[PDB]
Every structure is written in C-alpha cells, then in structure tokens.
C-alpha cells in the first residue's frame, strides 16, 4: 500500500520465528526499539501489528 494510506495486518493466534526475518540478507535495516532482534524468540506478545 501507498504511505498516505498504509496497511496494518494484525498477527495473532500463531508462532513466529523472528530469526527467519532477522537472519535474512534481504533487509537494508532492521532497527528495533524497546527490544533487541536477537531476543524476540525468547519473548511473547498479545498481538503484533505489521
């Protein structure tokens, strides 16, 4: 979607291996706030919004 009207996906009721994202060479940045990307598999959430 275009940045004037950006699209929010709710993620819920599932397991995510964040290493599948963070280990990828595909990303030009992966900057995180309040959490470090290496820790995200050890930790869990009510929902995630993309």
């Amino acid at each position: 979607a275009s940045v004037y009207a950006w699209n929010r996906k709710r993620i819920s009721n599932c397991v995510a291996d964040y290493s599948v994202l963070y280990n990828s060479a595909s990303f030009s940045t992966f900057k995180c706030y309040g959490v470090s990307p290496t820790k995200l598999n050890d930790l869990c959430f009510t929902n995630v919004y993309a």
Partner: protein, 47 residues
C-alpha cells in the same frame, strides 16, 4: 587479526554487534580495546 569479508558484513566486527560472523567465526570480547580498520579491496580480491 587480518582477513577479507563482504563489505556489508563489516557492521558485525565490534563489541556488542550481532550477526552470523559475530556468533560463529570472529567474536570480539564484549570489552574489546583496540581498533577495527576496513577498506574496499574489489580491485585486489575480486575475480
């Protein structure tokens, strides 16, 4: 310590930095004292 790396991966060469080379094959100490010098060597080391 002397070696060739891909230019994008030079980020991993520090105390506190994270990635596959920092995890596996070239861990620096968390309190490392010294200097990291890196430069593009495409004209020397590509084929």
């Amino acid at each position: 310590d002397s070696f060739v790396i891909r230019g994008d991966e030079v980020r991993q060469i520090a105390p506190g930095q994270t990635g596959k080379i920092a995890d596996y094959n070239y861990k620096l100490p968390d309190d490392f004292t010294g200097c990291v010098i890196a430069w593009n060597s495409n004209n020397l080391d590509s084929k």
